[PDB]
């Protein structure tokens, strides 16, 4: 795993997944140089997709990409048995990897997380991206735990790290001997300087070419040029979290006239104050 | 809503729900004076129950209780369509009310929270208990949002408040359109002192009788007698969070030889260290 | 220690301590039922008094009170040498107790705190009220450290507890080593329910009579009547922290035409937005 | 401007008194090793536990010993505005090159209170001023909007030592401020420079000045492959520097290495036996013994 992997939105139309818009979105991202696509993660609205829709979206992404970039299937759950069914499906349907979130809400212990991901890792042969986002899940996947997992299971391959405490990123790089992927667009630059190898990205849905450029300069070690793009995208990056992801990214795509449509409850339209702000940021970049 | 409402565990035996054990537990609680039972909440491991088991547990609680005390059924979800469907089922199956958790993990705005709970309120005629636990969900249901909800829908009746900042409870009581139930055993006494009317409780699975008396003292305004049971049980209350609920409560029940059985992954067995502490707490109380 | 001790403001006039206003304020609070006076704490702007103003304000409080009620002198500092000096001064000048805050900013360890408070307790024969407020000091004085202090030093007699996690208060009460005084006006009712014996108060500066009545109702165990006043005063109690104390309380006292005067930098006049909220709260109470 | 590595020097004590000879010897050690400047009597220097007179004499000793070879930044912050002015005026009068000025701690002023506070400091002197933000100690966060107003009004508001570990605060400063950002966290120094910061005010540069200077110069020149190598080699040491509250670990470490430090002043006190051993092993691993 290296470079930019947009966490793609799931577009909706007439209350159903918009499979055609999906294809068009995927092809857009591929023309602009992304290394891969993460299907049905948080930005894909996994919580509000039926079991059956989650499967059809993954299959659609696998079928459209048709090997041109890595397809990473969202397969996390806070129920271990479900995380297994999903991971096995991702392998069977032809995904190249699995993104597996730490169980949210039920708050397992570190031993719980170890056991949980261990089952997941044993269930499939695919590379697994562990996904840590304490601010949403109420649990922090500790580096020592990842080190144990990584040393037991060769397919445990990377961490998408969205803990904003970057000394966790140092511990992972130093002790854990795992690939770190940024889980926060705005921390991608400093995480890559730390040893990080890429990013699973929200904003790359909107500006894939520029984000790909930025990340490529950061990987090459050209931070002067990376910073230039970072600072240019900086207001857009802030606007991506002006309300909870994916409310902003879908709003922005609608404003640009790209496929996205409605958010599913309990997610809902941005405030007007917030819209105008995003509106202005998009205008400043000449995106609309 | 008034008094002690144990949030019951879901006992397991041979990877299946222990229906006889459930029945044994319910009658134990009823016989010790609880006002009602909360089925398949987070203490009942709802995250790791199948859709089928969820419905079967609630049906069994309804049928065993047989109108004797209130049955409040867990029916929340971070997907609104799923919340509506669970709530409809609880009504159709004969439950007296619905416990509805704020969407966890996807972090809806206050407006999205209001829309989510509105859809739930509109789907059923049963009284609804809203459930706020920011330390698990990563979202705080604000008192002004409860106020707007209780104003719009007459079946929005109570809030199980587990926010540990008791100014939020004072604000709920002040902006007075709902009954406040303690969502934390150890804060039950000060929450009733503030004007709370009961508790949805973990510890009441273990010491139903004593907790019922404490609460009744607090409700009567006799805090000297209430404090005396609070303090007797204080070490027990702490041990109930020595690891993530329901790990300790199930552990404790197994210890006492009562129906409980295993935890489902990613929840797992307590530390040897932590069990020793729990064991000793239990022993000092003559429960083992 | 029992009942209501206002932490009095230090009024200023023409850039100097307003000793007459001070006298007038003290007399007003005594006439309206307070149990004592806390001089030159945080609410009295101790960080912005010179060393000589600090000693003078305390001397004046001692002199005006003239033994009528207990005088508790702010002493204490994040430098142990200064804390001893301040404490020995309080004794020499005729105060009845000392209020001693945990060192702020320099973050000593629990062992550091024990040694700091030990040196203070050895330096004087007066009773000492420990002051814990992690939200300001960046340090939490653990109940086990209090237990240890109280066991070694018989003049460590109380803790002013401003940690809003009321489990910490339950722990302090369970050890029964020490009197608990509320450090937060709005948590006074629930803290007394838990076994607290009173409050070091901000809002008592504004409504001494009403707050004294609330607190006595609570100490007698009449929570029905305690609740009535707590809810009557709730919007005021919130207004008291709408910005950092003592900016609201001095603002309210000036609006009321009582001695208070200017705030010393870095504290400064409240926002116009916050002034409007406070003024309406004072008007609702008939205080302006 | 401010650039490169500025250690926040300890104040060494001998027999309950500031150890001036030890202080001199520490200063020359750091200068020998290529530091850009010295930060005197900040938190690492136990500013809370020094007398007024010790504070003054310590800054005086630092100015004199340094003798213009490197920049001297004098800690002169207080949570009392009148005292912050006084300390600042003194730093200028005595010959320091710059003032470090911490957001008032404990009393929790509002943003506007902070602006007015730093405004009075800035009006009091002509020295460049480094604003120090460290919410984990002060209970307050100086917002980039507030820094931007300061810098727009006062030409001598020159840098921020940023110890807030939320690094998008750092990119908000780089993006909006026009102030120099200095790292306030040894372990975040490398990612802060990547974001465009220009150096660090450092605890660990007291122990390994030559290594830190060179890691920083690599990160400054944009050679992150080599910055990373030194960052990870020092990573256990950087964590040890906060194993207990700074400056407990750094002084414990200097004493272990037989360099001037001596005792901590209450309420600071000796490290636990368990923490001592962890520190010792990391010192042993780097061969600092």
UniProtKB/Swiss-Prot annotation, chains A, B, C:
SMART domains xrefs: DHDPS
Entry's EC annotation: 4.3.3.7
Cellular compartments annotated: Cytoplasm
GO biological process terms held by the UniProt record: diaminopimelate biosynthetic process; lysine biosynthetic process via diaminopimelate
Annotated Pfam families: DHDPS
Site (Part of a proton relay during catalysis): 42, 105
Principal location listed in the UniProt entry: cytoplasm
InterPro entries: Aldolase_TIM, DapA, DapA-like, Schiff_base-form_aldolases_AS, Schiff_base-form_aldolases_CS
Active site: 131, 160
Cellular component aspect of the GO annotation: cytoplasm
Catalytic reaction(s) noted: L-aspartate 4-semialdehyde + pyruvate = (2S,4S)-4-hydroxy-2,3,4,5-tetrahydrodipicolinate + H2O + H(+)
Superkingdom field: Archaea
Amino-acid positions noted as binding pyruvate in the UniProt annotation, renumbered to this chain: 43, 200
Gene Ontology MF terms: 2-dehydro-3-deoxy-phosphogluconate aldolase activity; 4-hydroxy-tetrahydrodipicolinate synthase activity
Keyword field: Amino-acid biosynthesis, Cytoplasm, Diaminopimelate biosynthesis, Lyase, Lysine biosynthesis, Schiff base
Enzyme class: lyase
Similarity comment text for this entry: Belongs to the DapA family.
Primary role: Catalyzes the condensation of (S)-aspartate-beta-semialdehyde [(S)-ASA] and pyruvate to 4-hydroxy-tetrahydrodipicolinate (HTPA).
Oligomer and partners: Homotetramer; dimer of dimers.
Name of the protein described by the UniProt record: 4-hydroxy-tetrahydrodipicolinate synthase
Taxonomic source organism: Methanocaldococcus jannaschii (strain ATCC 43067 / DSM 2661 / JAL-1 / JCM 10045 / NBRC 100440)
Gene: dapA
């Amino acid at each position: 795993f290296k470079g930019v992997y947009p966490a793609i939105i799931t577009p909706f139309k007439n209350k159903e997944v918009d499979f055609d818009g999906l294809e068009e979105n995927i092809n857009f991202l591929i023309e602009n140089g992304v290394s891969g696509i993460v299907a049905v993660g948080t930005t894909g609205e996994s919580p509000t997709l039926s079991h059956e829709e989650h499967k059809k979206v993954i299959e659609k992404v696998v079928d459209v990409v048709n090997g041109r970039v890595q397809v990473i299937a969202g397969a996390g759950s806070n129920c271990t048995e479900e995380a297994i069914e999903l991971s096995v499906f991702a392998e069977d349907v032809g995904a190249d990897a699995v993104l597996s979130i730490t169980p949210y809400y039920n708050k397992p212990t570190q031993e719980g997380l170890r056991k949980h991901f261990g089952k997941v890792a044993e269930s499939i042969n695919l590379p697994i991206v562990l996904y840590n986002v304490p601010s949403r899940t109420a649990v922090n996947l500790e580096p020592k735990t990842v080190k144990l997992l990584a040393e037991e299971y060769s397919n445990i391959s990377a961490v998408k790290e969205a803990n904003p405490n970057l000394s966790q990123v140092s511990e992972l790089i130093h002790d854990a001997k795992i690939t770190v992927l940024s889980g926060n667009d705005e921390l991608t630059l400093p995480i890559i300087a730390l040893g990080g190898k890429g990013v699973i990205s929200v904003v790359a849905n909107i500006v894939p070419k520029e984000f790909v450029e930025m990340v490529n300069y950061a990987l090459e070690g050209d931070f002067e040029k990376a910073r230039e793009i970072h600072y240019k995208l900086f207001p857009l990056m802030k606007a991506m979290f002006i309300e909870t992801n994916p409310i902003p990214v879908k709003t922005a795509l609608n404003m640009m006239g790209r496929p996205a449509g409605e958010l599913r409850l309990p997610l809902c339209e941005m405030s007007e104050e917030h819209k105008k702000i995003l509106e202005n940021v998009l205008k400043d970049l000449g995106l609309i």
